[PDB]
């Protein structure tokens, strides 16, 4: 399967609206998946599909994608989200579970 | 529903280790299984997975021929198994429910995504004391 | 102590035994009639994973059965394949003279395996398969078969819907559509024929189908196009 | 009599039954079984298809004893029963003329 | 009523068919299946014989459509279904003296 | 009419036979074949039951002689045969009030 | 629809259901009966390569069978062992309860193979197969059958033929007669059961006989011994 | 020509044909009744090798049955599984719907070898072999059977006795009782039911059983307590 | 009913000798047929014996493995083989039938006894001329 | 089979009553059979059971037991009756037939 | 009714030759296929035959081991096969329809005869240029 | 099987009467076939059985037999009926289709 390409870093003043990419093959037909990771847990859920996030998750998470681009938003980050975060899809000519490298938020809340 | 887990298999290169996952509050039915693997100071890897509806699996490129992905229905467990261990395979391995799923209402979309995630299980190999 | 029932005027009317009404005519044998009715018709569920929770299978009792001379056209019939895991069969073979029912619009066929415990399926609320012109207490192995009852009296094309199914005789049983060899859906009672009809021809336009040897399975988002009420057969 | 207690009913029965001409009778020539069957519309007229709906609720259990008792495997003689039963009820025994009992008219 | 068509008539009918002493009537002692047969001849009285073969040319049409019908693999009903419209079409309904249609006289 | 000349005779009947609550009826639920039987017992009123057995003695030579005469391996229709013959002995033909023949009272 | 006859004054009526005629006195169900005839005595050509014209398989259509009480003597009646070129049988193994014709003067056995296209092999007229009381629609393989007809009413040695075929489904069947295991006569529609008994008869006293291991056949010479004008079997 | 007898006033009346009699009331079929009675009832001797004497093989004779509606609790009923010196079985296998006899005292399973030269075993004086509401004019193997008649009118444990026979077809059967495996008495027309059971109870309780792998047969001293004169099941 | 034996049989030490017993008046049925040995000066000494019912074969332990008892129910004969014959072994065989008897009247008792006896096989081995 | 035990020999004066015993496992919970052998005879049943004896054997011999121990009596012994005699049980332990070593029974006729 | 044979076929000794004939008109049927040479200068020899209702092939001694004949009736044609071919197998080789005819009318007579006739196949086995 | 025995040639006068004759054990008990061989052609059946002869042939050829002994008579023999004569029967105890050597027949026509 084709890799999901992300940049490392990305850093966020605490309370900025902050904008995650990711890009891919697997992106042009479907949607991405993106998990929020803190150290020493279980990656977890936050937004999937085209439209929706799981209970739990905090009305600062939406997103969307065009073309083979998806993004997540994070509006109003809090010093609570700093967290490496991934996308998720599937590349169907292979069908491989594709992870994008991540990302690592920074909030800078000092 | 949850997934629970193996503790920390220790073990020198050249064993094979079996990691087990449990699910809970649930039957597998016919979700998908999948393993990824968390290198530490590494983004997450696909390794494979299986469908216990069929029994069948597959696996990511890199570890074909040395893992192998079962379950067992009547105990609602899975088992990944690692064989030939090098200390580069030093990772926390987690277990994950994946479904595939249809946006049928409206436009027609497809994704998929992991529910839910086990706590991980650390395996570490190393020559070392 | 099977009753008669007896048309009249455009009604029906039970005929006693206990009195004898002299108006009753029968000149021939060719008024006497057999005839199979659905339960469809009664409005009982027909989708497979809410129907087959009507069957169930018990050992040392006999199959029997009955004939007819007409009766109702299926919108839904079904025809059984079930395995043990061993790969034993659990359905006995239909005997000579046994054909599936003449007229389905739909026809559900489950391939599948179970704890099949018993020696024959049975139908727990006491109704009837229906066979080509027969009523039997049991199901037979791989024939076509409409749910229903029957009376008696003194007066084209079909779709095949491909299913699969594990853990079938018990209450934890797990089904999938078949799309295509290797694509399959999660099934649910919401879905009708005409739903899993349209939700085929949209994974083959997409091209969300299997491209490998190993098998796929989409799950349906919970949020379907739910236009239609409850709406019965005939509406 | 019988009035319909069931959760709905389908009240327009289409149906099918077998009831010849060249050399289309001989079976050599004649048609496959799929083809043997003739059809036709009911309507509901004065209730009379919600009456035997209902008729075949309640014949099911009568029936099913019935099975129970014997032992031929494939039972086609419940019509021939009936039609056997229905005249030793008015002819059986002897008929008297004078009474309420022979469907006979002087 | 019936006139022979056929191209030939052979006048003479030489049947079997199969309507008991001592110890013969018990299975283990009496004959096997090729001896418990009877057998007669009859002559074209009147034009009997060349008669009936001309029934079974008509005949024939009505029972295969007969047994095109049915889901019996073996039908031996015939015989008693006649006897029941026979009676029936006599009996069944009511009786009427005064009328042309019940065969009782007074 | 009967009168028994066995070497001995039981005198007391002990019998069995098939002659429905809930959902006893339904064959899933209902009794296994061990279990379908009732039973009672019928003394001796009258010599009844010797006559009986005695029957029973006579009644087996006509039987082997009728299944003999048949190709059915099944034969349930004896009694509806019976049925048959019974009504017609005295309905079938022509009924004459008149005579001593018919079954039926002016 | 079947119709019934009656005789009366040695003259046969049918019986009109219409009409309704106080005189048919039915006292029992003994005076009812049910009669096998054969078409020999109608005319019909009995010789082997003339009457297998009439026989032909099809597929899709099931078998039947009714009960005879009584029935004709046959003079011609036959027994067919039909193979496919690969060695599969043609006709199916008689079930349960099938016996060959109680009376028959003789037997035509045939062996042999050819396109058994269909299941089953039926009358092309319409008429039955007689076996010991039973009249059916199909032939059953290895089993002496008459060729016949049925009709309903109010009121010893044998000669055993041998025959071989190929081509036995087509119009291009070749026939052969056996005289001895290696020595065969070709057959022709010419040829009566006497004509071919004396002709076996003069075979074996001339002499001209296979004396080897291979098959010898001898063509009849055109010119025979025609004294008989079509004669029916009752002149 | 089958007699059937009507009851009236508590007493038994065989209808005649010839004389009709208007009195006989036919109201319904179910007033008509097929019985099946045992053969003991008449005082026939039931003990094994005495029994075993009215049964007898023959070929050339095809079986029938008959159905019943009720019928008599036997005391005494058998079980046989008989081959040939050669392992061959000697009956055949019951046909579907064959069940045994449903309520019986005693059953007198007996396992052994013989002579059987017929196709089927037929019973000599005429009677029936009584099955689950059937009557056999054979026996079929491993299948209880009572033995008796039928009538026809107007209107729990038991105890499994096993023994073995070797030349059981013929006059010069020999025959032996089990009480364990390996242990085996004598068995004589003089030793009831109730004297079998008893001799049982007295070797286990006394130890003198086989102790080995081989078998051991014990003979019955002439001196019985000959306490019943010769009393009938029901004295 | 009476046994008959084969006359004497005189061979060298190493031969085999098959003695034969025939019924007569009787079928053997159930009954055991036994086999014992007088040698001159001695007791009787129990060898061996059969139940043609069923078959089988019981031997004193002296001779397991040296003889063999068999029969033929066709002509109600019996047959003792004995190999590798020694000078010990001259001897006259008896042939009898044995009766198991239990006694079911009153008290209850057991006990065997032979009832018919054949005259006895005179069998002498010996290399001397 | 345990081995039945015996005297080898008994001398009885002409007339006089003798007792024959025989002992061992076998006839403890048994009776043992007697038999007869004159010289270049068969051995000949004289008695069985506990109490019978077959045709053929006058009244001079019955017997009786107790025990493990078993015995014959012959009564008014008489100058034909010298014999060997032996006594024979069965030991259901090994299921082998077993007879006591025999007596010889002298009649002193001279 | 016409049978028609190959052309010419010429060869080096130690060669097959494989010479067909072909039915017009008629199919074989029951009639026996007969297969005859001529040697120039000589007269004619029979080879041998088949009959196609059978299969059955029947050899002059002098050929036999070296031809075989066979036949297929779907094409209505026969073959006749020849091994070891040497000089003195130049013939020409003729198939033929043969008829075993009996009379039965008046007398009782017996005759063979060939009622078609092809036209013939040169064979020629020469080691020559 | 047997072989038929010809005279190797015949001359017969143009317009003469010519008799072919053949002889063998397979004559004894049948009849011979006569066959006509034109230079380069197929033999010609010309007379078969005890009486007959396809048609084409003209009525000059006729025959008969006796004993082991077969002839042709070829009428009138034309300048057209030079040809070689072969007679043909079967040795039915081989089951052989024998021929005969043949004959040269030459019609003194120049
Ligand atoms: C003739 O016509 C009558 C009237 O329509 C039919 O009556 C039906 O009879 C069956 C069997 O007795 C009834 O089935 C039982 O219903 C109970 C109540 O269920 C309610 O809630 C469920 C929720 O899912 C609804 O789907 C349902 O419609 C009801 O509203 C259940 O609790 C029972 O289940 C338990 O028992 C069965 C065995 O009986 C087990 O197999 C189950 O696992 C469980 O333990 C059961 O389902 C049915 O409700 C009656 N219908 C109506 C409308 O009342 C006759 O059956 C019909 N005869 C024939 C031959 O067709
Ligand atoms: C009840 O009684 C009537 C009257 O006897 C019978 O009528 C026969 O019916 C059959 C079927 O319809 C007729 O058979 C057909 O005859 C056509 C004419 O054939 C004439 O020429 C031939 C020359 O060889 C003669 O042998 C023949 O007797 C006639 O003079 C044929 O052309 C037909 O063949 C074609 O169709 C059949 C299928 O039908 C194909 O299988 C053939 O290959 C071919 O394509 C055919 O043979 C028969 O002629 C009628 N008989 C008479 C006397 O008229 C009923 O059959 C009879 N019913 C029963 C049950 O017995
Ligand atoms: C309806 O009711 C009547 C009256 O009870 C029954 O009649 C019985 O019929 C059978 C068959 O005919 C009779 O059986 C024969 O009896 C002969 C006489 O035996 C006497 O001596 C013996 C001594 O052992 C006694 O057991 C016996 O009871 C008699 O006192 C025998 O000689 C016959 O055997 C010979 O023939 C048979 C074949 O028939 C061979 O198999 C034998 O090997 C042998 O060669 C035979 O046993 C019987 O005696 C009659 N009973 C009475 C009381 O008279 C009907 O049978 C009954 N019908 C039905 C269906 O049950
Ligand atoms: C699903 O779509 C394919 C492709 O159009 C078609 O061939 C198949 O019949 C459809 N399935 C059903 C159940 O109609
Ligand atoms: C229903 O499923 C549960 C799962 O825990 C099981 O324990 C129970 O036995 C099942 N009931 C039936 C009737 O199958
Ligand atoms: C042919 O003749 C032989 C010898 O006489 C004879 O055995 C055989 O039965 C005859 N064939 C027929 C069909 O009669
Ligand atoms: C009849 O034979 C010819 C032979 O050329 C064949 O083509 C034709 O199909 C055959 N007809 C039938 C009805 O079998
Ligand atoms: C068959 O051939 C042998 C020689 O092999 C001969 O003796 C015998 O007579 C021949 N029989 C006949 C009938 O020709
Ligand atoms: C014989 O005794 C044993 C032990 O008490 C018992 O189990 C067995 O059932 C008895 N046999 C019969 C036929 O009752
Ligand atoms: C009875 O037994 C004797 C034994 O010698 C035997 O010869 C005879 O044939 C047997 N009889 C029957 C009818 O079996
Ligand atoms: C069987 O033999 C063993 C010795 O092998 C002994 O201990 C046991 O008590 C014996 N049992 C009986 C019932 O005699």
Same mark, same amino acid.
């Given at each position: 399967? $084709?890799?999901?390409?992300?940049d490392?870093?990305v850093?966020?003043?605490?309370?900025?609206?902050? !904008?995650?990419?990711?890009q891919?093959? $697997?992106?042009? &037909?479907?949607?991405? $998946?993106?998990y929020?990771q803190?150290? !020493?847990?279980?990656?977890?859920?936050?937004?999937?599909?085209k439209?929706? !996030?799981? $209970?739990?998750?905090?009305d600062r998470?939406?997103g969307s994608?065009?073309?083979?681009?998806?993004?997540?938003?994070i509006?109003?980050?809090?010093?609570?989200?700093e967290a490496?975060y991934?996308? &998720?899809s599937?590349?169907?000519?292979?069908?491989?579970?594709?992870?994008?490298?991540?990302?690592?938020?920074?909030?800078?809340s000092? | 529903?949850?997934?629970?887990?193996?503790?920390?298999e220790?073990?020198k290169?050249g064993?094979?280790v079996?990691?087990?996952?449990?699910?809970?509050?649930?039957?597998?039915?016919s979700?998908?299984?999948?393993?990824?693997?968390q290198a530490?100071?590494?983004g997450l890897?696909w390794?494979?997975?299986?469908?216990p509806?069929?029994?069948?699996?597959?696996?990511?490129?890199?570890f074909?021929?040395?893992?192998?992905?079962?379950a067992?229905?009547?105990?609602?467990?899975?088992?990944?198994?690692?064989?030939?261990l090098?200390?580069?395979?030093?990772?926390?391995?987690?277990?994950?429910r994946?479904?595939?799923?249809?946006?049928?209402?409206g436009?027609?979309?497809?994704?998929?995504?992991?529910?839910?995630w086990?706590?991980?299980t650390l395996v570490?190999?190393s020559?070392?004391? | 102590? %099977?009753?008669?029932?007896?048309?009249?005027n455009?009604?029906?009317?039970?005929?006693?035994?206990?009195?004898?009404?002299?108006?009753?005519?029968?000149?021939?044998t060719?008024?006497?009639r057999?005839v199979?009715?659905?339960?469809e018709?009664?409005?009982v569920?027909?989708?497979?994973?809410?129907?087959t929770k009507?069957?169930?299978?018990?050992?040392?009792?006999?199959?029997?059965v009955v004939?007819?001379?007409?009766?109702?056209?299926?919108?839904?019939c079904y025809?059984?394949?079930?395995?043990?895991?061993?790969?034993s069969?659990?359905?006995?073979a239909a005997?000579?003279? %046994?054909?599936?029912?003449?007229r389905?619009?739909?026809?559900?066929?489950?391939?599948?395996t179970?704890?099949?415990?018993?020696?024959?399926a049975?139908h727990?609320?006491?109704?009837?398969?229906?066979?080509?012109?027969?009523?039997?207490?049991?199901?037979?192995?791989?024939?076509?078969?409409?749910?229903?009852?029957?009376?008696?009296?003194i007066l084209?094309?079909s779709?095949? %819907?491909?299913?699969?199914?594990?853990?079938?005789?018990?209450?934890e049983?797990?089904?999938?559509?078949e799309?295509?060899?290797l694509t399959?859906?999660?099934?649910?009672?919401?879905?009708?024929?005409?739903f899993?009809?349209?939700?085929?021809?949209?994974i083959?336009?997409?091209?969300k189908?299997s491209?490998?040897?190993?098998?796929l399975?989409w799950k349906?988002?919970?949020? %379907?196009?739910?236009?239609?009420?409850?709406?019965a057969?005939?509406? | 009599v019988?009035?319909?207690?069931?959760?709905?009913?389908?009240p327009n029965?289409?149906?099918?039954?077998?009831? =010849?001409?060249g050399?289309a009778?001989?079976?050599?020539?004649?048609? =496959?079984?799929?083809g043997i069957?003739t059809?036709?519309?009911?309507?509901?007229?004065?209730?009379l298809?919600?009456?035997?709906?209902?008729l075949a609720?309640?014949?099911?259990? =009568?029936?099913?004893?019935?099975?129970?008792?014997?032992t031929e495997?494939?039972?086609?003689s419940?019509?021939?029963?009936?039609?056997?039963?229905f005249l030793?009820?008015?002819?059986?025994?002897?008929?008297?003329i004078?009474?309420?009992d022979?469907?006979?008219?002087?």
């Amino acid at each position: 399967g $084709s890799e999901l390409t992300q940049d490392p870093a990305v850093s966020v003043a605490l309370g900025q609206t902050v !904008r995650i990419t990711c890009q891919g093959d $697997s992106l042009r &037909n479907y949607y991405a $998946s993106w998990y929020q990771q803190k150290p !020493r847990q279980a990656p977890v859920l936050v937004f999937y599909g085209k439209n929706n !996030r799981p $209970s739990g998750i905090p009305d600062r998470f939406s997103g969307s994608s065009s073309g083979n681009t998806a993004s997540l938003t994070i509006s109003g980050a809090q010093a609570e989200d700093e967290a490496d975060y991934y996308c &998720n899809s599937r590349d169907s000519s292979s069908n491989h579970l594709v992870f994008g490298g991540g990302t690592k938020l920074t909030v800078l809340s000092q | 529903v949850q997934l629970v887990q193996s503790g920390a298999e220790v073990k020198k290169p050249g064993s094979s280790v079996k990691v087990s996952c449990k699910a809970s509050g649930a039957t597998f039915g016919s979700d998908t299984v999948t393993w990824v693997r968390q290198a530490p100071g590494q983004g997450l890897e696909w390794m494979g997975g299986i469908i216990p509806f069929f029994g069948e699996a597959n696996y990511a490129q890199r570890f074909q021929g040395r893992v192998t992905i079962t379950a067992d229905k009547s105990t609602n467990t899975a088992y990944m198994e690692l064989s030939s261990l090098r200390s580069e395979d030093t990772a926390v391995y987690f277990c994950a429910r994946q479904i595939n799923e249809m946006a049928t209402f409206g436009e027609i979309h497809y994704y998929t995504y992991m529910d839910v995630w086990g706590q991980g299980t650390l395996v570490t190999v190393s020559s070392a004391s | 102590s %099977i009753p008669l029932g007896v048309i009249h005027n455009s009604t029906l009317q039970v005929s006693d035994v206990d009195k004898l009404v002299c108006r009753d005519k029968l000149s021939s044998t060719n008024q006497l009639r057999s005839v199979g009715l659905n339960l469809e018709g009664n409005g009982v569920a027909t989708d497979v994973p809410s129907v087959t929770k009507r069957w169930g299978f018990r050992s040392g009792v006999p199959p029997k059965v009955v004939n007819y001379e007409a009766g109702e056209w299926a919108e839904n019939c079904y025809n059984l394949e079930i395995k043990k895991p061993d790969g034993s069969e659990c359905l006995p073979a239909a005997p000579d003279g %046994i054909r599936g029912f003449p007229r389905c619009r739909y026809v559900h066929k489950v391939s599948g395996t179970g704890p099949c415990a018993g020696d024959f399926a049975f139908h727990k609320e006491g109704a009837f398969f229906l066979y080509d012109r027969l009523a039997s207490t049991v199901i037979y192995r791989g024939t076509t078969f409409a749910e229903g009852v029957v009376a008696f009296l003194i007066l084209y094309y079909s779709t095949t %819907i491909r299913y699969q199914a594990t853990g079938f005789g018990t209450n934890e049983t797990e089904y999938l559509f078949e799309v295509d060899n290797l694509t399959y859906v999660q099934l649910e009672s919401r879905f009708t024929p005409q739903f899993l009809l349209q939700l085929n021809e949209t994974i083959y336009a997409s091209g969300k189908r299997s491209n490998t040897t190993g098998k796929l399975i989409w799950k349906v988002n919970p949020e %379907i196009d739910t236009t239609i009420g409850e709406w019965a057969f005939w509406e | 009599v019988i009035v319909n207690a069931q959760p709905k009913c389908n009240p327009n029965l289409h149906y099918w039954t077998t009831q =010849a001409i060249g050399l289309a009778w001989i079976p050599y020539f004649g048609p =496959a079984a799929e083809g043997i069957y003739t059809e036709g519309l009911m309507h509901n007229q004065d209730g009379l298809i919600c009456g035997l709906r209902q008729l075949a609720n309640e014949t099911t259990q =009568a029936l099913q004893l019935f099975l129970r008792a014997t032992t031929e495997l494939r039972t086609f003689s419940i019509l021939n029963r009936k039609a056997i039963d229905f005249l030793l009820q008015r002819w059986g025994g002897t008929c008297h003329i004078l009474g309420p009992d022979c469907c006979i008219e002087p």
